[PDB]
Every structure is written in C-alpha cells, then in structure tokens.
C-alpha cells in the first residue's frame, strides 16, 4: 500500500488474510470435515467502505 | 542442603504466610458434541490404485498368406564317375 496518497492521486493496495480452521499445516485441531452435501459453510467478509 | 549452627535455617516456612486467594477451582466441563453432516460415498482423485507401466514390452499381431509357386532352372546331366 502506498505510504501516502497525494491530492489528486490514486493508490493501489494488496492485502492477504489467512482465515484458519486447522491450527497449522501439521496440527489439524480445529479443522472442519465438510463432506455432507446439502449443508453449506459460510465465510462472511465485511469490507471497509 | 547445609544447615549452619548457630545460624540455623528456619525450621519451616511458618504461619505468617499470606493466603492470597481462594481461586483454586477448576469448574468441571460439561458438554455434548455432535459431528453429523451427511457423508457421500465417494471422493474424486486423479488416479488411485494404478501401477503404471514404466516400459511396455514390444507387442504384435500375425498374418501369413499365400501359395506355393515356382520358376526353376536345373543343372545339366553329367557323366557318372564310378559305381
């Protein structure tokens, strides 16, 4: 993200988030078994405005 | 441990100690846990169970056909030697 955005300018930003279920790549504590067809998961994202 | 007389090590931590809390209790956990989503019998993979050929042998089919035909030229007659 640009440190500053001057009057009249447009800045571009990139951001990444990892939303964990499992604790880590080797510790599956918290993971979710999703093999039940009719029954969906929901990941709600509320963005800045 | 060394004890040295006359300065002896108190014979205990005595009764002047400050009990700081009664927070000693771990409340037992009571819970009901249900992991029940419909399971479907199948998973898709690229390949499971195959033991792929690293080299094949050479393989073939077979045919023959024809008849017995011929054009011939013979050696001339010769004088017989002996017998």
From Swiss-Prot, chain A:
It is found in: Virion. Homotrimer. Major capsid protein self-assembles to form an icosahedral capsid with a pseudo T=25 symmetry, about 66 nm in diameter, and consisting of 240 capsid proteins trimers. The capsid encapsulates an inner membrane and the genomic dsDNA genome. The major coat protein P3 and two assembly factors (P10 and P17) are needed during the assembly of the virus particle inside the host cell, when the capsid protein multimers are capable of enclosing the host-derived membrane, containing the virus-encoded membrane-associated proteins. This is Major capsid protein P3. It comes from Enterobacteria phage PRD1.
UniProtKB/Swiss-Prot annotation, chain B:
GO terms for cellular component: viral capsid. Dimer. One of its GO terms (biological process) is viral capsid assembly. The keyword Protein biosynthesis does not apply. It comes from Enterobacteria phage PRD1 (Bacteriophage PRD1). It is found in: Virion. Minor capsid protein essential for stable capsid assembly of complete particles. This is Minor capsid protein P30.
């Amino acid at each position: 993200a640009p440190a500053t955005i001057a009057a009249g300018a447009t800045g571009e930003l990139t951001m990444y988030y990892w939303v964990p279920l499992a604790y880590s790549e080797t510790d599956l504590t918290g993971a979710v078994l999703a093999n039940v067809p009719q029954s969906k998961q929901r990941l709600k994202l509320e963005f800045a405005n | 441990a060394l004890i040295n007389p006359q300065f002896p090590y108190a014979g205990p931590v005595p009764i002047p100690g400050p009990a700081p809390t009664e927070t000693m209790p771990l409340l037992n956990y009571r819970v009901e846990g249900r992991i029940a989503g419909i399971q479907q019998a199948r998973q898709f993979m690229p390949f499971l169970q195959g033991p792929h050929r690293a080299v094949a042998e050479q393989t073939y089919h077979a045919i023959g056909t024809g008849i017995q035909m011929g054009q011939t030229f013979n050696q001339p007659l010769i004088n017989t030697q002996e017998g």
